[PDB]
Design an enzyme around this catalytic site. Structure first.
Site, mmCIF file in Angstrom:
data_model
loop_
_atom_site.group_PDB
_atom_site.id
_atom_site.type_symbol
_atom_site.label_atom_id
_atom_site.label_comp_id
_atom_site.label_asym_id
_atom_site.label_seq_id
_atom_site.Cartn_x
_atom_site.Cartn_y
_atom_site.Cartn_z
ATOM 1 N N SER A 105 0.819 -1.216 0.000
ATOM 2 C CA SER A 105 0.000 0.000 0.000
ATOM 3 C C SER A 105 0.849 1.260 0.000
ATOM 4 O O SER A 105 1.581 1.531 -0.950
ATOM 5 C CB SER A 105 -0.947 -0.001 1.204
ATOM 6 O OG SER A 105 -1.690 1.201 1.282
ATOM 7 N N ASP A 231 -9.724 -6.545 -2.935
ATOM 8 C CA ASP A 231 -9.159 -5.484 -2.091
ATOM 9 C C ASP A 231 -10.185 -4.379 -1.841
ATOM 10 O O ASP A 231 -10.714 -3.788 -2.792
ATOM 11 C CB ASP A 231 -7.905 -4.911 -2.768
ATOM 12 C CG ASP A 231 -7.031 -4.101 -1.831
ATOM 13 O OD1 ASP A 231 -7.542 -3.358 -0.962
ATOM 14 O OD2 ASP A 231 -5.801 -4.175 -1.993
ATOM 15 N N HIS A 259 -7.036 -6.931 1.208
ATOM 16 C CA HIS A 259 -5.842 -6.100 1.058
ATOM 17 C C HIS A 259 -4.556 -6.693 1.644
ATOM 18 O O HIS A 259 -3.491 -6.601 1.024
ATOM 19 C CB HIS A 259 -6.057 -4.704 1.644
ATOM 20 C CG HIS A 259 -4.885 -3.802 1.423
ATOM 21 N ND1 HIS A 259 -4.496 -3.395 0.163
ATOM 22 C CD2 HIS A 259 -3.971 -3.297 2.285
ATOM 23 C CE1 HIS A 259 -3.415 -2.641 0.265
ATOM 24 N NE2 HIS A 259 -3.072 -2.572 1.542
#
Ligand SMILES: [Cl-]
Ligand SMILES: [Cl-]
Ligand code: NA
Length: 283
Positions: A105, A231, A259
């Protein structure tokens, strides 16, 4: 089997986890931006596995965990500048000229900017649900980055739950996990700097990570972009966007996955990542 240290990186100290310190080739692992995020919460499963063959460095990223910045600015673009320089300062402090890199991320976004700004310091890269592509704010990323507008155990439990497609993989009691994770989240030594990172809001935060097509086209590193099909935070379309623009990037997408690919599919992610760095998927 794991060492910790506090190491000076510019104007502040970085809390560092290390394993496989006797190994010749290194991997720098950069965690994500869940509230209360730190290196170990992301990488505690990957570290022992990768350390069998690689020197792993997993720092708390500036503003997170025990790597509090000395003079935290506001605005995501300024934090990206700090996050990039932090990793260079870390590699310099460890005498490491080149390293493999993994980023989740926010950490994947930092990875992309590191490859753009300091390409000579990096070998292969693995991204996992990275920011860096343009997208409208998702429900997940909004509730995550703007958590402290309305913080509570319940809100944190919801986030933790949404990071996984099957929350039961976490353990039999997520409420208990949120309860124990909550005290850390509410410390001023954790809250104030997270608020400052995304003070411009979710959209400005997302846009701040986006590299231009020319920048992406000129990232030459061999890369593996991994992403969870389901996600809830970073849209799968980002992964498609990135591989359309980065020349030497392969893609892997996991089904029935949230995620946190590295927690949901520990064995699959750990092995895919290791085998990629091993060269199994080379041309
Ligand atoms: Cl995270
Ligand atoms: Cl995140
Ligand atoms: Na450089």
């Amino acid at each position: 089997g794991m060492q910790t240290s506090n190491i000076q990186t510019g104007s502040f100290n970085t809390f560092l986890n290390e394993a496989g310190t006797d190994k010749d080739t290194s991997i720098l692992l950069l965690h994500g931006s869940g509230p209360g995020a730190n290196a170990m919460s992301n990488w505690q499963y990957a570290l022992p596995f990768l350390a069998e063959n690689y020197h792993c460095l997993a720092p708390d990223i500036a503003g997170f965990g025990l790597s509090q910045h000395n003079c935290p600015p506001n605005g995501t673009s300024h934090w990206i500048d700090i996050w990039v320089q932090q990793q260079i300062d870390l590699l310099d402090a460890k005498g490491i000229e080149q390293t493999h890199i993994v980023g989740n991320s926010m950490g994947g976004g930092v990875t992309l900017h590191l490859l753009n700004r300091h390409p000579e310091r990096f070998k292969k890269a693995v991204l996992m649900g990275p920011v860096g592509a343009p997208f409208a704010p998702t429900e997940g990323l909004t509730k995550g980055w703007e958590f402290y507008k309305d913080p509570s155990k319940e809100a944190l439990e919801y986030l933790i739950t949404k990071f996984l497609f099957d929350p039961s993989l976490l353990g039999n009691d997520i409420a208990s996990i949120a309860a124990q994770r909550f005290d850390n989240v509410m410390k001023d030594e954790v809250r104030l700097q997270f608020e400052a990172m995304f003070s411009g809001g979710t959209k400005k935060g997302i846009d701040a990570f986006v590299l231009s097509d020319d920048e992406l086209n000129n990232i030459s590193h061999q890369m593996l972009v991994t992403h969870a099909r389901e996600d809830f935070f970073i849209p799968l379309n980002n992964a498609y966007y990135l591989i359309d623009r980065i020349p030497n990037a392969q893609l892997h997408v996991f089904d029935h996955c949230g995620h946190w690919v590295q927690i949901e599919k520990k064995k699959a992610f750990n092995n895919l990542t290791k085998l990629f760095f091993d060269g199994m998927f080379d041309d």
